[PDB]
Ligand binder design. Structure first.
Ligand code: HEM
Ligand code: HEM
Ligand SMILES: N=C(Nc1cccc(CCNCc2cccc(NC(=N)c3cncs3)c2)c1)c1cncs1
Ligand SMILES: N=C(Nc1cccc(CCNCc2cccc(NC(=N)c3cncs3)c2)c1)c1cncs1
Ligand SMILES: C[C@H](O)[C@H](O)[C@H]1CNc2nc(N)[nH]c(=O)c2N1
Ligand SMILES: C[C@H](O)[C@H](O)[C@H]1CNc2nc(N)[nH]c(=O)c2N1
Ligand SMILES: [Zn+2]
Lengths: 416, 416
């Protein structure tokens, strides 16, 4: 009931009581651990009025506890107010302050996110008066511009109107506001980004004129108030890009690679007080490995280890020459170097993982715990030479939270 | 009840029914996942006669099912026999065949072991007639010699008499039959292997004449039938060692490093049919990263990244030059190269992880599943460029099994 997690490198012991406030479920039982299932059903999302108030009260109490008026008149009257409103409409509306708190704490509670030492420095844009896809494009363009901020990136979330009936949902159909296109070839190979080949097709179906190349920024596909979604091109001047060069190998420019500065995830669902925001795109900045190892080296992604190893003159015959490992370290030094030489915010896996340990200590102290998903916190390269490898982590689902949700094209009831 | 695990690189789906035969517990609940706690209490070990028969029957049934005589006369009479013997002595004795099956299947069930594609090629040495520490030394020397086999390593386990009352326990007090000594310094630094500094002290207390250097093979500390443990020196001619050179950097020999060929874990507890074998040392061969990344580069181990980076002329000022990563790939190419150039069995993390995927497929097919601990299966470097990174794994505890147990010097009731 008062659990202990240890670091097996520093011998530090932290005690976790926060897990007791845990609400959601994990997928694990006492007979089976599912800590490596990607999308557990407890991580995915018509909610009634009988369920809604406990959720609303649960949220309202931790908000008023947080600002040092738990049970004050303000708390009880707002408790009374929201209760009355859930009667009138079997739903309710977050105060602007409650919206910002909820958003920041969904981030704070994201157990797979190594970047949460920044969780309270988040810019919340209230887009809940938005009614049209054109409104959404506008809000999203102003998110991109503010967050990019000339390479000195700033975290930000834009929160569109909450779900209501279920039909009238706002959804951004992109997985990220900025993503490169994926076109497959006649021979069956893939041009661009194999991850988005299905989405690229959907855009082409709605009428995208594809400039079938490599690093082609996809258009936005915006669904407002349940209607069929609509194509919009982000002004290219808002899309900041970094050309990838190496600080020692001048042939690295010849590879002619570039990635985008602003990672901005748009397919997730934000939950606050039992209210569901189906469109809530959020941006921060990149940890280096996300692009260098995953984006660039996943076999089912760009898969360049092949080529980079060629230009390094690497013994590619035997697996045990570790040539894949050696091409991977170089590709990640060049991602970092390229981004920094342009003053575009990026963080390396060593600095990020040390900050998360530092953040974890703060959380156990001032908050009693910190949910953490080891399988996701540990970088996809150089695992054990980063401090998180040797940190025991307890994982559990607190709310407010970010959740997965189906892709709109598996769920949307069409009419056009 | 029929769970699905997916590979997110090949899109392969395997279905798991074996988890239904799961007996032990995991530490996870539906409110908390503990898949990154090192030693969960369900992984650690006076068992009565009322508990003993179900366990004995459970084991006996899967053994007779395995050899295609489930319920045959042989099965029922052996069921009757063992029941009768658990009456007479509230314990019982494994047939030589049941001992070999149990041992091979404890390995087969080890969910943290990436090497299990070999699980049925295991040499079981029955040391259950052993009565003295001198007997144990002899059995262990013959294990070392057989398993090493001139560098062409062979898997093997030596099984000492089962626990009985609790006092009269056989224990090898070494964590591994072969380990380098750890002496700390006047200035407080550490000479040799910081992991074994406490054990080295214990050997010095029982009267080891320490040759306080770097790679000093520790003596064996053997406890037989509950008595105080006793020091024995493995004949140095039985301890095969590999000098670590690099295939490109000739200064790498100057580093003057060597590791031992034979990894052989001796502090674990083998469980078969409710019987407990407190001493059961087992050996296979190394995956490269165990020495190159963990042994050599853990901060609380040998911690040579410092030095290797110096000789590479690496920018050690900024964390984000990835110099630690770059020194780590080289150190692992040299471990592999050194071991292979001497025909000493070793496996690289790429070849090992691909075999485990291949093994996992066989197990789901012919057995209905394969317990796997992602946190441990994924190598401590180059994670996502190995296929196990993207393999969803279900973890659960099947028996026969290998379990942890306290260090004998926290439990042993002394008299000498
Ligand atoms: C500020 C800089 C940030 C950094 C450096 C960072 C870093 C990371 C990384 C490396 C991951 C691993 C996910 C993957 O590899 O695909 C992750 C996951 C995640 N981050 Fe953070 N992040 C940042 C900001 C944010 C913000 C602003 C939010 C929300 C407001 C957020 C919420 C999440 C969530 C919900 C996940 C993973 C959940 C899942 O996929 O199931 N992050 N982050
Ligand atoms: C034959 C070659 C083998 C290879 C290449 C291999 C590889 C590995 C590796 C890399 C680990 C990770 C543990 C660590 O990093 O400390 C591991 C764990 C383990 N192996 Fe295997 N192993 C082999 C043979 C065996 C044998 C012969 C047995 C028993 C009969 C065994 C049982 C285990 C167990 C019980 C664990 C981990 C359990 C724990 O620490 O909680 N292995 N193995
Ligand atoms: N389908 C595949 N994986 C896969 C499937 C479903 C989901 C996922 C997880 C994708 N999370 C993206 C993500 C989420 C949160 C943060 C980040 N990062 C960042 N810095 C930021 C992005 N915004 C603000 S911060 C990135 C991966 C594969 C294909 N091929 C090999 S795996
Ligand atoms: N105390 C620390 N860790 C730690 C603590 C307790 C336990 C452990 C796990 C040790 N498993 C050793 C082990 C088990 C099984 C297989 C192998 N490998 C092999 N190939 C083989 C060895 N025999 C046959 S095959 C290695 C690690 C640390 C100190 N500093 C940073 S972590
Ligand atoms: C805290 C965490 O559980 C610990 O570092 C684990 C992680 N995974 C591991 N995996 C292996 N193979 N060996 C280990 O020692 C560890 N250590
Ligand atoms: C199957 C496994 O759960 C999958 O590869 C996970 C592992 N850990 C990860 N960690 C991060 N940061 N991102 C990922 O996509 C994944 N993928
Ligand atoms: Zn779990």
């Amino acid at each position: 009931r008062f659990l202990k997690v240890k670091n097996w490198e520093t011998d530090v012991v932290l005690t976790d009581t926060l897990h007791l406030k845990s609400t959601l479920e994990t997928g694990c039982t006492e007979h089976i651990c599912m800590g490596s299932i990607m999308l557990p059903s407890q991580h995915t999302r018509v909610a009634t009025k009988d369920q809604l108030f406990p959720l609303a009260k649960e949220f309202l109490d931790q908000y008023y506890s947080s600002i040092k008026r738990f049970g004050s008149k303000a708390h009880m009257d707002r408790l009374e107010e929201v209760n009355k409103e859930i009667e009138s409409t079997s739903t309710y509306q977050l105060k602007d302050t409650e919206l910002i708190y909820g958003a920041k704490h969904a981030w704070r509670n994201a157990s797979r996110c190594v970047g949460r030492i920044q969780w309270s420095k988040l810019q919340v844009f209230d887009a809940r008066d938005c009614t049209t896809a054109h409104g959404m494009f506008n809000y999203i363009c102003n998110h991109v511009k503010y967050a990019t901020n000339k390479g000195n990136l700033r975290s930000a979330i834009t929160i569109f109107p909450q779900r209501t009936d279920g039909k009238h949902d706002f959804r951004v159909w992109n997985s990220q506001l900025i993503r490169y296109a994926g076109y497959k070839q006649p021979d069956g190979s893939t041009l661009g980004d194999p991850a988005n080949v299905q989405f690229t097709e959907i855009c082409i179906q709605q009428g995208w004129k594809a400039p079938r190349g490599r690093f082609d920024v996809l258009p936005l596909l915006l669904q407002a108030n349940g209607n069929d979604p609509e194509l919009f091109q982000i002004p290219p001047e808002l899309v900041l890009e970094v050309p990838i060069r190496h600080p020692k190998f001048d042939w690295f420019k010849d590879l002619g690679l570039k990635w985008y500065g602003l990672p901005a995830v748009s397919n997730m669902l934000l939950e606050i007080g039992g209210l569901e925001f189906s469109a809530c795109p959020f941006s921060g900045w990149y940890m280096g490995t996300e692009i260098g190892v995953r984006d660039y080296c996943d076999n089912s992604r760009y898969n360049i280890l092949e080529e980079v190893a060629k230009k390094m003159d690497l013994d590619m015959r035997k697996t045990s020459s570790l040539w894949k490992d050696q091409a991977l370290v170089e590709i990640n030094i060049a991602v970092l170097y390229s981004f920094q030489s342009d003053k575009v915010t990026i963080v390396d896996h060593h600095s990020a993982t040390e900050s998360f340990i530092k953040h974890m200590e703060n959380e156990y102290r001032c908050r009693g715990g910190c949910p953490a998903d080891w399988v996701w916190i540990v970088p996809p390269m150089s695992g054990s030479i980063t401090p998180v490898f040797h940190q025991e982590m307890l994982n559990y689902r607190l709310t407010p939270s970010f959740e997965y949700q189906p892709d709109p094209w598996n769920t949307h009831v069409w009419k056009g």
